[PDB]
Amino acid sequence: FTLIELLIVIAIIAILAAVLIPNLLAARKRANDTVVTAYLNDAVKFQEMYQIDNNSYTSNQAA
Amino acid sequence: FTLIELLIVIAIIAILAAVLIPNLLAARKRANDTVVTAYLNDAVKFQEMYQIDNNSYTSNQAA
Ligand SMILES: *[C@H]1O[C@H](CO)[C@H](O)[C@H](O[C@H]2O[C@H](CO)[C@H](O)[C@H](O)[C@H]2NC(C)=O)[C@H]1NC(C)=O
Ligand SMILES: *[C@H]1O[C@H](CO)[C@H](O)[C@H](O[C@H]2O[C@H](CO)[C@H](O)[C@H](O)[C@H]2NC(C)=O)[C@H]1NC(C)=O
Ligand SMILES: *[C@H]1O[C@H](CO)[C@H](O)[C@H](O)[C@H]1NC(C)=O
Ligand SMILES: *[C@H]1O[C@H](CO)[C@H](O)[C@H](O)[C@H]1NC(C)=O
């Protein structure tokens, strides 16, 4: 094992470190939109439950 | 000490002076090829370092 093999190893590490890491921001954006969609789908279920009890929809989240 | 001993001494000096000196040219040839080999091994390390920075090899020594 010699300095030229070790420079090749360092060079290839620099390549793999650059390319094998995903765009984390783009991944989290799509997960975050799923949270919003899921929370609105829940708010919709609870608007219908409030409608069962009160014959009207809520304007306030605490209800 | 006499002229015949001194002629023997001169004769043996002439022999030792002829045989105890190495072929200097042949020795330097093998050392010189080692310099070339070592310099190309260095140029190879630096081609890999240029490849790390530029994603290409150099055509010019100044790089
Ligand atoms: C939902 O609650 C809101 C405050 O959290 C706000 O009060 C909205 O307006 C209501 O005001 C009172 C109830 O607080 C009224 O009797 C009606 O429910 C309603 N008034 C008007 C102007 O409609 C309430 N819902 C909405 C958006 O009407
Ligand atoms: C390495 O440098 C050479 C001069 O020192 C020479 O320029 C070679 O050719 C390049 O020419 C320019 C860069 O100077 C180009 O944009 C390319 O890098 C290259 N051109 C061609 C024809 O390939 C350059 N490397 C080599 C041998 O291509
Ligand atoms: C929801 O009910 C709780 C008690 O169960 C509190 O009264 C709260 O204030 C209610 N939210 C609103 C403001 O409608
Ligand atoms: C190497 O870099 C030096 C500066 O650090 C000079 O710019 C020199 O010209 C370079 N060699 C070439 C020609 O690539």
Description:
The PDB classes it as protein fibril. This is part of a larger assembly, with two copies of chain A (63 residues). Chain A is mainly alpha-helical and 63 residues long. Chain A is rod-shaped and about 80 Å long. Chain A has two helices and no strands. One 2-acetamido-2-deoxy-alpha-D-galactopyranose binds at residues 60, 62-63 of chain B.
Write the layout of secondary structure elements.
The structure is cut from a larger assembly and holds 2 copies of chain A (63 residues).
Chain A: H1 3-19, H2 24-54
The structure holds a molecule of 2 linked components (A2G-A2G) (2 copies) and 2-acetamido-2-deoxy-alpha-D-galactopyranose (A2G) (2 copies).
Q: Concise description?
A:
This is part of a larger assembly, with 2 copies of chain A (63 residues). Chain A is an all-alpha fold.
Find the count of extended strands of chain A (DSSP E, 2+ residues).
0
**Helix fraction bin of chain A:** over 70%
Distance between the termini of chain A: 71 Å
Q: Count of DSSP helices of chain A?
A: 2
SSE sequence of chain A, one letter per element: HH
Characteristic key phrases:
binds 2-acetamido-2-deoxy-alpha-D-galactopyranose; mainly alpha; Type IV pilin glycosylation; 2 helices; protein fibril; 2 chains; Type IV wide pilus major component PilA4 (chains A, B); rod-shaped; 0% strand; Type IV wide pilus major component PilA4; 63 residues; twitching motility; binds a molecule of 2 linked components (A2G-A2G)
